């Protein structure tokens, strides 16, 4: 650390890495779906729904 730069640390770049990436479907399933009309639908409004 110095006055000119206060954001220097060896371990600033890495935080709690633990397991690399995530396990497949660790917290979320991988559900697949075909776009059939009266079964699945893109919501009516678009912009505040991304």
Partner 1 sequence: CQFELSGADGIVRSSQVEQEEKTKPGQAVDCIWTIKATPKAKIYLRFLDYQMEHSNECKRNFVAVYDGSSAIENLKAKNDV
- The residues of the shown chain that bind ligand NAG, judged by CB under 6 A, are 7-9, 12
Q: CA–CA separation, 26 vs 22, rounded Å?
A: 7
Site string for partner 1, 6-45 (x = CB under 8 A): ------------------------------------x---
Q: Is the dihedral of CA 17, 19, 25, 26 positive or negative?
A: negative
As a whole number of Å, the CA-based R_g of the chain is 22
Answer with the entry of ligand NAG, partner 1, none that 50 interacts with (C-beta below 5 to 8 A by kind): partner 1
Answer with the entry of ligand NAG, partner 1, none that 23 interacts with (C-beta below 5 to 8 A by kind): none
């Amino acid at each position: 650390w110095d006055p000119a730069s206060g954001l220097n640390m060896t371990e600033s770049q890495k935080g709690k890495p633990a397991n690399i990436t995530d396990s497949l479907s660790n917290r979320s399933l991988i559900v697949t779906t075909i776009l059939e009309e009266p079964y699945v639908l893109f919501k009516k409004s678009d912009k505040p729904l991304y």
